Structure formats: C-alpha cells, structure tokens
Amino acid sequence: MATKTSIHPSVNELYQRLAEDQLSNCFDRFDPQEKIRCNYCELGVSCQLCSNGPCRINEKVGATLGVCGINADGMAMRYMLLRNVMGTSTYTYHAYEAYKTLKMTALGNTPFTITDKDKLYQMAKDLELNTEGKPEDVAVRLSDFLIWELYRDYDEPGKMIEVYAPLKRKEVWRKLGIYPAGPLHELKDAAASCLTNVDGDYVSLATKGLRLGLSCIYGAQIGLELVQDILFGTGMPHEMDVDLGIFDADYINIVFNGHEPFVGVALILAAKEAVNQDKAKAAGAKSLRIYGSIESGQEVVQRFQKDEVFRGLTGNWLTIEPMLATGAVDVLAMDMNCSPPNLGPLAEKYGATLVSVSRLVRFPGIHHFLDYKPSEVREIAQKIIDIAVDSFKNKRHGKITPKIPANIQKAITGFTPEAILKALGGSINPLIEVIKAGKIKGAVGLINCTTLKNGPQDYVTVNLAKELIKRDILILSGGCGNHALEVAGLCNLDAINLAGPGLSEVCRNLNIPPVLSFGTCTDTGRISLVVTALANALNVDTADLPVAVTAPMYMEQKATIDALFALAYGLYTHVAPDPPVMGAPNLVKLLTRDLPSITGGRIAVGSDPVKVADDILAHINDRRAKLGI
Amino acid sequence: MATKTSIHPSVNELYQRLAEDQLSNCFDRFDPQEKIRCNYCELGVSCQLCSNGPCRINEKVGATLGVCGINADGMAMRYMLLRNVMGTSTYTYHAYEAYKTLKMTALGNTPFTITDKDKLYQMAKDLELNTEGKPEDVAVRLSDFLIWELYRDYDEPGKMIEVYAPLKRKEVWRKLGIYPAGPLHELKDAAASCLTNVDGDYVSLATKGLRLGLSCIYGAQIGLELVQDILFGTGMPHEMDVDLGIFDADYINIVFNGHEPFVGVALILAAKEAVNQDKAKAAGAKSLRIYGSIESGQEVVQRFQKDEVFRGLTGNWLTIEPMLATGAVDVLAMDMNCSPPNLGPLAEKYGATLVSVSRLVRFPGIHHFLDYKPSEVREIAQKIIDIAVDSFKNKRHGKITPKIPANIQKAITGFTPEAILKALGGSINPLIEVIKAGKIKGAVGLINCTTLKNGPQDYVTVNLAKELIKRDILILSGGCGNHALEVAGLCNLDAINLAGPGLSEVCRNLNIPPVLSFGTCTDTGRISLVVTALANALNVDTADLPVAVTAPMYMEQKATIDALFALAYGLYTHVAPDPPVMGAPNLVKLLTRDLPSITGGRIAVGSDPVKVADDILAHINDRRAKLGI
C-alpha cells in the first residue's frame, strides 16, 4: 500500500491484520478524504456559522466578504477561536473534577489519600490560605480556592498568576490587556464573541485567543496538575516498559485510556486485592493486569512503578485501533479524548469490551456506561473488573487468536521540575552553567499530538527530536508526541549517544536522557514552571531565553491552546501541520511576523525535520548572542 | 433586477441608495456566495475540527466516515451542538451582566433603581429567600442567588426549574436524563464533548443539545428577564412608532443596537437632562432624540413610552445597513449581536459615528470603544451624547443629504403574561373557554431571526403570520421576527381585519391585536410561563396542547437554542431555512419522526407560508381531537 501508516514496526504489523480483516481504520480512511480535500477549508476561508451561508472567500468571482460582511482574516481567526473554546473546556472540565476529587478524598469518600502533604502545605502557604487544623482541612480549603480560580470573573484579581508567572511577563500582559479572568468566564466570552455579527476583527479575536491560553494555564492546568501530585505523588524518574509487546494474552487485561487518571488509579488499587486476582485465576487466566493508554496512561507512568499488576504504557492515539487488533484486550475503559468513534466493529472482531467512564465519551457500540463521580469510583472500578472477567471467559479466551508484536522499549518517565532540581544537586545553577558554556545550546518544550496529515504516525516528531538533540538542544516532552519519543527509544540512557557533543557530555555526567518525559499536554503549565525558573535565574524575560516550543504533528485544540499560551508567554512556537489560517494574509502576518513586537513570540511552520530544527537553533543562537553567550 | 431584497418598501428604497453609492451590503453580497455554494456544508456533511481534516462524506469514493471514524449523523449533530454553545454563551453573558447590574444598583452605584418592587419580593418568596431588611438587601440576595443558578454543577439541584417548569415536564426530563446543570457548566460540557474523539454519537449529541436548551431557559433567560422587569418595570400594552420614517434629520439622533438594554436606558435618562437638550440646541439641532434598534430596542419599547426623547424602534438586523443609508444617524451604539462587521465604510459615507459599548463587539472602522460596567454606565451615556453632538456638527448636519423613507407604522408593544391576565379579567379561564369552543383553534410562539437564505427579508415570516391568523391561530411573537410583524402592521388593531372569524371576534372583545408582541428571543422563557399556565388549567402536559413554535427565517443560534428548548418542552417546532442537517438521514429521522415518542416534540420544515401554516393547523387539530375539543 501507499497508505501512510507509522514509523513504529509494532503498529505497522497490526495495521496488516486490520487490513487483512478488512476493518475500517484511520490509516485507510485518510486516503478517500485525500481524493476530495476542500481547498477553502484547508486555508481557513470557508464559514458555516449562520443560515446566510455556507460562505467562501473567492475574490476572482466577487466573493470578497461573507454575506454578513466579514473578511477572510476575521473568518479564519474566528473559527480558530471557536475551536479553542473546545480545548479550553476540556482542561476546565478536568480541573473541576480534580478539585472535587481532592475535596471528596479529604472527606473520606474515595479510595484515594493525601500523598504529597509537603506540596499541599507549600501551595496553601504560597496562596495565603489558612493552614490550621488537620491536613484534610487544608485540602478542602485548597480545593475551594482552586474552584474559585476557575470561576473568577474578569473583575476580580487572580492569585495563581501572581505566584507562578515571572515579573516581566506580568507587566507585558497588563500593558496588552490580556490578564485573564477565570477560564470558565473567558471561554464563555470567547464563544459569545464568535457568534455571527459580534466580533469580526481578526486582531481582537487573536488577542482573545491569547487571553484564553493564559486562562487555561494559570486558571486550570497548574492547579490540576499540582492537585494530582497531592493525591498521587510528585513524579520522580524511573524505568518503564512501553510499546505493544507489553501485552500477554494469558492474563485478563484492562486498559484505561483518556486524559483523567482517577479511574485508572482506582482500577490498580482494586486489582491488587486478592479477591479480584482469585476471580481472574478461577476464570482460567494467569492473573489480572492493568495497562495505560495515551494521556491517562502517561499520567500514571509519571507517578507509579511497573509491577506485577500495572504493566506500562501502550502508545498514543493512533495506536488504539492497532491495540485492539492484538486480540489481547478484555476491557478498554475510556475517560476522554482520544476515544475514536469507530472502535465498535474492532472490539467485536477481536473480542474486547468497551466501557465509557465519562459522560463526555459516547459513540456507537459501547457496551457499558459508568459515568465518573469521586464517591462512586470504588464501585466503578470493581464493576469494570467484573465485566473484564466475564468478557475474558465468554468472548476472548479460547476464541480469539492473539497477535502481539514482540517490540518492547525502555523509557525513563516521571521528570518534573522537582526531579530536575534533584538531578542537578538541589539548584538550577549547574544547568545555567552548562548553557552559558555552550554545552547545551538551549531547550525545547515539545508539546504535541500525533496526526496523519503531515506524515506517517510520529514521523515528523521523532525525526525532529533526533535533529534537535544532535544540535545540543535538550528536550522536555509532553503529549502523544512524548509517547512517540518513549516508544522510539529517545527517553532512555542509550539515547545519550544520539545527542551532539555538548548535550551527550552533560547527559552522561548527570545520568539523564537527552529527552526528559514531563508527561502530558496538560503539563504545559508545569513546563512553564521550568522556563519561569530559568527566566528568574538569568534575570531576563521569557522572550529573551534560549528556548522554543514545538507541536510538530498537532491534531486538535488541546495542543493549539498550549501554542496560544506559548505565544502569549513570549516564545518561538513551531506548529505543524499548518493550522487552517493560511488564506488569511493579514492574520498570517500578525502571527508569524508582527507578534515579536507585541508579546515577543511568533508562529513558525514546516514539516521538514532538518529545516525545522535549523530554524529553532537559529532562534536559540540569536537569543544566546544577545545574552552574551 | 433579480436581487433578493426585502418585503418592506422602506428598506427597498434605501437599498437603491446603497447600490447607487456602490457600497457593499448584505443583499448584494448574497449573490456572489450563491455562485459557489458548497453542497457538503449545506447538508452538514463536512468537518473542520482537526488536522486530519478537512473531511467530507462522499460514499462514491469510499469516504463514508471521517478520518477519525465519525459518521455523517455524528458529524452534523456535533457541529450543531458546537454552534449552540455560542448561542448559550450569549444568553449566559447577558444574564450575568443583568445580575451584576441589579446588585450594583442595590448598592447605589448606577443611574437605575428598583422599579417593580412587587416582582422583587414575590420572586424572592417563590425562591424561599430571606425578605427581611431593606429592599436593597433583598435585591442583593436575589442577585447572588441567580448567579449561583448560573454556576451550579450537574450534581446540585436547581430551584428555578422547580418553580417555573411544570411537573409533567420535569418527570419526562428526569426519566430522559436531561435535567440540566447551570448553563456555565452545561456549555463547557457541550464544548468538551465536541472535541475530536470525545462524543461521536448523534443521539447523545442531540440529547446534550436538549439539555443545553433547558439550561438556557431556566438557568439564564427567566432570571434575566425578571431582573430587567425589576429594574425597568413589567411591560404593559401601549402604542409605539416603528419603521425608518421615525427619523428626522434636524435632530441629534442616537440609536442603541444589540440585546442588553442597560446603555440604552442610561442614554434616555441622560438625554432627558436639560443641560443635554441645551447642548443639542446650541449645536443647531431641534433637540436630542434616542432610538432603539433590534433586540435592545425591543426590550425598551416593551417597557417605556414614546415621548419627546425616546422615539421608538427602527427595525431588525437586516435594517441596520439601510438605516445608515438614511443619512440621519449621528451615533450607532452597539452592545451585542447583530452588529455587522462591514458597517465602517457605510458610516463613513453617510456621516455616522460608530461606538462599541461591549468588549464582545469589535470590527474594522469603529470610532470609539466604551466597554460596559454598571458603575461606569452614567459616564458612558454622557460620553456618547457629547460624541453625538460633535458628530452632528462636524460630519452630518447640512453636509450629508438625508433620504428618510416616509413609512411609519403603529404597533401595540409590551405584552407580558401579566398583561394577558389583565386583559382576560384576572384569570386564564376566558382564554381556555374560547379555545375549547373553537373560536381560537390554538396558539403559536413565533420566535425568530431574519435572514436572506429562504427569501427577501421577512417575506416568509410576515406571510406565515398572515396565514396563521386567517386560520384562527393566535400568535405570541419575539425576536427580529417580532420586529418584522410590527413593521408590517400585524401588531395593531387594524390587523384584526386580517384574522379569521373566531380570532377576530375574540380580538375585538378583548381589544387586542391578533399578534401579541412578547419582546425578544430572550423572552422564550417568559413565553413558556404562558404555555405552562395553559397546560395547568387543562390538567395536561405541554405536549398535549394545541400550540406550536416557529422560527421561519432563523439565522443563528440564539434562535436554534430556543428551538432546542421547544423540542425538550414537547412542542412541534417549525424551523426554516433548513439547519445544516439534511445529509444525515438518521439524525433527520430522530428530529422529525422519533422525538414525539421521546420528548413529545418534533422538528418541522419548509418555507412555503400556506403549506407551513396548514401543517401547523393539522398538528393543532390533532391535539384538539385527542383533548375532545
């Protein structure tokens, strides 16, 4: 086939089974869409927002404006803003559930506990909360405070942004009028702006997008990730097994898949109970095992070890259909994106049971719906185990032929700001030393999805990462793009020898890989803590640091909201494939050429790994020169 | 000339001036878009939500599913849900500002007061709030409670829905799982569901649309309209002037345009100050006048009299460009949709000044930006007056040639539930008796925009209304469609001559027109109070009543969210033009054929006035037969 598949042999092997079984799958479905691609939509110059449409910009035939009067620049930026309301809403949804989960845990009504009490008290102190009473009392106050940050209106000052952002950024944001309200109000204001005949000004709409990105990081992401650390521990580096060879057909295999890790943690706790292992053995299995997929899986591997029960990370979202084709999964428990909506016929062919554990996730052919509530997660996890044992006995065992690829890779996971400081001996200064000396030229935040638009699964991401480390650029990674680097072997100690002269030397001395796994796209806020620490140590603004961000195989608006944040934060932000805006020439000029004089950041483009890496290195070296290094 | 223009002569005269002046306008811009219409988008079977797209459904080349695996029905319903997030967001934005305006008024910080104190105390008692102390204390408490209704989550029981919705409906909603959270959480949940690889199930997406409609009416619309009644009075029927002949070129003319009435009320109060009338006269004007446009204008005409200062209502949103072509406007002050984004060049040519009074409203060529805050609205109004005096002197008077059409129509505005009860002698019983006897066959809620898609401006709306009243069907109207019927003369006593024999008899006896102006699309919740009262008097469910809803020239999602509410409320709901759904056969079946067995309601379609009226009458007669009347 000339069908774009994957850079990973395990996925290519399983794609062959899908094709031979004549089952629909993302790789094959790309080809028919390629025959009929709409150029207007590709360029951002179509609109479907009201009944006078649908409209298109085509100046050659006199269609210079939409019926309502909007121009191409406003049209393109408006649809970008509307889609980014979806991205912000997902992070806001997740944060709210994290805060309710901490509150209910503190009240004693979940299987969870308060694990990182030091972080709980430090956060409460930094936010000037009352710290008297028991740890549980403090956790309740923190949960209510972080809910207040979600709800804050555009007229009440926030505290998270003051604690966690650097000084010069705050001044820039106040000058521009982009200090945000809470994300719930900001996303509502953004959506209202996009209604027909409201905001048709591309500069205004772009500014609203920048505000929305700031609200997402300071108003949702930083709080949610620190709360998940309080519940489940702060990650430290440890070795993890990845890729699809981690499966063994003789066990009952439950896979959790999504972004929110609460059900997965409850499943691991329940699977460790003897009553449930005994059930699996009586059903004919060797034992019962739990596995993570995509971002929920990554959240767990950041904080938990591989053991007899929890087995590691399968892969990113384009691995889900291949995973079912192993014929080894008993339950796939899905909590959020990505849960692709044609899994039904694959689950039927390969003998797997599909369980949704969120009211958000629905599609044809799901077998069970167990919507999450903190006070019911113990019961949900036990029901899932019961379903999995019956599915193994009645659907899979003795009926489905397994075809599990042999590929397994090792990755060191669980890097956090805290783990970096520890690896440096307690201070950031040794990292500053090696950057000033030129051994490490700079650092890149790789915050990405995966997609088929600009290559086989993960092709641009992995090859770009190789080119960056060759140029002595350290990578901090999150998202489906992080899962790709783990599976490709860039996150273990052998990868030291893939780096250039200075970075390989530093990594060898510190005993760390040249790509540091920081988790998920939800950890963009956490990555900003590292960049903010560098800004303070060098006493410079973030826009002047030798850093950059890349989302090189972006798919949807969890990544683009992080890119909008990076722009507001003053950074060179590479995005591929092109977002649908290139038919809007004044918008393109704003994002790629004029933003350095506004926020300090800019959008960069392209899918050639060498050219993209060269352009990033040139920016880094420009920053270095002005710093005197 | 074959161009689609308007049913209204005044608009047609002003279109000729726009054309002579070679200025772009909605009527002329429709033609170029016609030449290149995308049939995939017309049918709802294109998607632009992620980078693997843009996708289209075309079975001939094997493009049966999007790359992600979503089918045509999920694709169409998902984009409908996302767009209705925008609609819900505008109502939620408006409600929040109304509640902050009431609270700040109670604290003494605005030019407004507590006008309908009886409504304040009755609403507080119905909601079981503390009524001790000062009226201002009660108003603060009510404002805080209604803000809580906006913010309540999916697991916290509402009170507005219990007070204002009937039990038989509440039982259906609980059985279906569509009892909503507050609108802020509901709209965030809906947006998150629309992200790629989250909710791809058309039945689930439709159900989430019904929930969203319920959250909008009970969590935003009823509260905001009753709070506006508390601030500005409860409407009673009175005579108003409408259409573009109300302008006079020798006065300073300030037009307020949008949905939120706060700036408009402040302008009327400021214009009544002798110092401001004196400024106008010293500038060469006869005096200073305020006019209302679209929904903000309608809110004011519902509650305020015509006098020497406030002159009435210009018309609906397709009248805005023609209105500027009169060469009589000094300031257009814009607070929300509809503010079409190419007004700039028209304002320049005709010598009018554009002022935005909301952070939502931005587009090229606006002259001043005065974002609303309750504590600043007194200063905003004064600044607008000073701007208008300068503009009259320097831009318009004696320099721009006015061309004001002669047309003025009379309309009886300000119908409310309270006004209907008063006209009936204090109870709904007389209306029940004339429905039972067959003098009035049934009643229609016409809750509508205007558009060019399915005819010249207001052609379908006005002619459908005429066909309905001829069939002895009473109309309650709101929205741009209400402005259309007012301008067409269907809302005065002369219009009784066009009603059928039974309705004309009732109208003459009660001294009311056959079309009752209930205000805006934001008054859908208020209209439900009348429908709930009819169902209670007859001891039946709302789905059993001889009523229907029509949005016969819908444009955007302020109207569609009201249609989704009407479906959830069990009603036959006619919508034209077709929403972009007709390429999705199972979604079409759900909405048009299966919903009667689910909620009781159904979507009806079509743009022929006679056929649409006959289909509505047939539904009414089916309901009557089942009731035995």
Ligand code: SF4
């Ligand atoms: S919002 Fe404007 S450009 Fe978009 S469909 Fe409506 S008339 Fe066309």
Ligand code: SF4
């Ligand atoms: S969400 Fe699915 S159908 Fe829509 S553009 Fe992405 S791959 Fe195509």
Ligand code: FES
């Ligand atoms: S698919 Fe309709 S304009 Fe692109």
